[PDB]
Ligand binder design. Structure first.
Ligand code: HEM
Length: 153
């Protein structure tokens, strides 16, 4: 359970992300695909992209980065009370997209790296720890729905 102070650190940096949702979404997905190429293979939509420059040039990738970060921002702003938001996302990711929980750990690492690069003054160690706690809570609650559905592993 995050404390109020931890949530304030999370949402303070997140309000900065929202100034350029699309640039953040591109940077996070590109870092994910470069750091963990098995993730790119899950996207029929993107798996034709073979270089970082091709990834940066893809408008469709930039659009999907916005989709992803808008869903995550709506979850963070619930401060843990996010059951209604996670149901459909766990269901699609487990049963349609076939995304292991581990790959959610990988995207969490990419989010934290990009927030540290773009917002160092608002993303000191206290805020890095709080965001890590918020993304761990996200993964914990998604993993429980995966397990219900027979996909935790
Ligand atoms: C912060 C974590 C993530 C969030 C908030 C998120 C959010 C979303 C949203 C909102 C959609 C569109 C609606 C839906 O299908 O449920 C989507 C689609 C999708 N996501 Fe995620 N996602 C996350 C992580 C991942 C990861 C790690 C992968 C793969 C490694 C992944 C793979 C996909 C795929 C394959 C689609 C369908 C893309 C298409 O063909 O249109 N997601 N995601």
């Amino acid at each position: 359970v995050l404390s109020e102070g931890e949530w304030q650190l999370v949402l303070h940096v997140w309000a900065k992300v929202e100034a350029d949702v699309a640039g953040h979404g591109q940077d996070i997905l590109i870092r994910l695909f470069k750091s963990h190429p098995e993730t790119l293979e899950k996207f029929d939509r993107f798996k034709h992209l073979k270089t970082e420059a091709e990834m940066k040039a893809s408008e469709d990738l930039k659009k999907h980065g916005v989709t992803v970060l808008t869903a995550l921002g709506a979850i963070l702003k619930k401060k843990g009370h996010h059951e209604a938001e996670l149901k459909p996302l766990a269901q699609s990711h487990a049963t349609k997209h076939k995304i292991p929980i581990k790959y959610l750990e990988f995207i969490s690492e990419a989010i934290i790296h990009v927030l540290h690069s773009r917002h160092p003054g608002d993303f000191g160690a206290d805020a890095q720890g709080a965001m890590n706690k918020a993304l761990e809570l996200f993964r914990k609650d998604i993993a429980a729905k995966y397990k219900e559905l027979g996909y935790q592993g």
